[PDB]
Amino acid sequence: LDAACFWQIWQRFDKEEKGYIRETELDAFFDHLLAEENVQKVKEQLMTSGRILMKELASMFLSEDENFLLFFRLETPLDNSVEFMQIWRKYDADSSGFISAAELCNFLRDLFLHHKKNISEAELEEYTSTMMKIFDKNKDGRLDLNDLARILALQENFLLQFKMDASSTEERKRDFEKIFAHYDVSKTGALEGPEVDGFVKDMMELVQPSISGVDLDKFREILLRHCDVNKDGKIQKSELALCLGLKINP
């Protein structure tokens, strides 16, 4: 049992990636696993004494590195969608709109290093291969933007909290300023690079399913063509204010 084989069994029960199975599904999960698994028996006993989280069962079957790969951000999530795109941009080094195995391997190498974990180059390729098996949904040999979001346990769309009422001039301004401060991580007065990316992603996702990395590139240029008044490729506060109908231009 490698992590990929385990994941594949688990995904037959956790079909909606809830990250748990039901307790009823537990016995039949063990049956799939038993097709030395004798640790299985030990395992049942372990917490047989309403759901069953993946970390619980996985703690008992996968290696310590494999548990790290599967849960290293369910513990410590991202800052926000800007940090997410920063990672995406860094590792899609050819800007393909897709993360390849050679690219994913670099992500894992850097991740292990910075977590202060030593692993051999042969380990790194097994992990690369294992991670690809788990997260490459359409089995096309590449990871899409949402796949990396799932590896990173990307949290909820920040923009969903804002409400249709709250139309007051004061409310719109409070909400503009909160939105702008969120994406302007570097505090420059403008959205640049992944700050743009993160805002595009969150905005587009208000009205359509999770977008691909190729489409993020397309929507990013469409947004710039819409509101980039001085055409410098960054979105100054005043440009976004005007395009969101803010009454007094900052």
Next chain:
Amino acid sequence: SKGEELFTGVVPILVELDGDVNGHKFSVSGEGEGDATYGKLTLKFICTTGKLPVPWPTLVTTLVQCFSRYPDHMKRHDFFKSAMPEGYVQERTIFFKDDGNYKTRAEVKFEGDTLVNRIELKGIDFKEDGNILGHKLEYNYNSHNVYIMADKQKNGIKVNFKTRHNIEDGSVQLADHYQQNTPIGDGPVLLPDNHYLSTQSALSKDPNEKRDHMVLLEFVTAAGTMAGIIGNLRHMALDMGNEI
């Protein structure tokens, strides 16, 4: 506001008008019901004094904007309902291009469980062979916007709009409206930001009615105010998504 609560289901309506246009006297009654939750109005009007000396379309606006549908994000701008139940006074001058003008005063309020609109209308300076006294307007009606602004001094609103009445030779008769609405009570009311009511009307007949009459159905919605910022975000997203 507490007025909103009074418009939650179907509400009966009565209308009474007494008029005099260039000396011709008439009286009109109407009854029906309003359904603000769906912006809908259903009414039937009758001339109780015989033949209507003007065309029915010239009276539509005079013959209850409290039955407009204000979307949830615009409830703070609905003056009409906020003045209920005590009601409001509605005053207008209506100028028909190249012809006469009407001047009206009405009181709109709850009388028991019924919303009642009582009106007095006076028209002067009409040409006898014009489009109005000559009955040359078509029995139909166009869609318009009604622009509403607060009038903070009088603790009401001032309203302006233009209606277009099709004439039988294919041209158009304009009617220019100036409108003031003032609360009857001294309780406080909602003074809105600038906006409009988008209005659509359809005129028809009651198949069993022998008297001179008009059946009117109306659908009205408030609009034109800015929503929460999430609204501009969603709207921009949809637009960016096109063609791509």
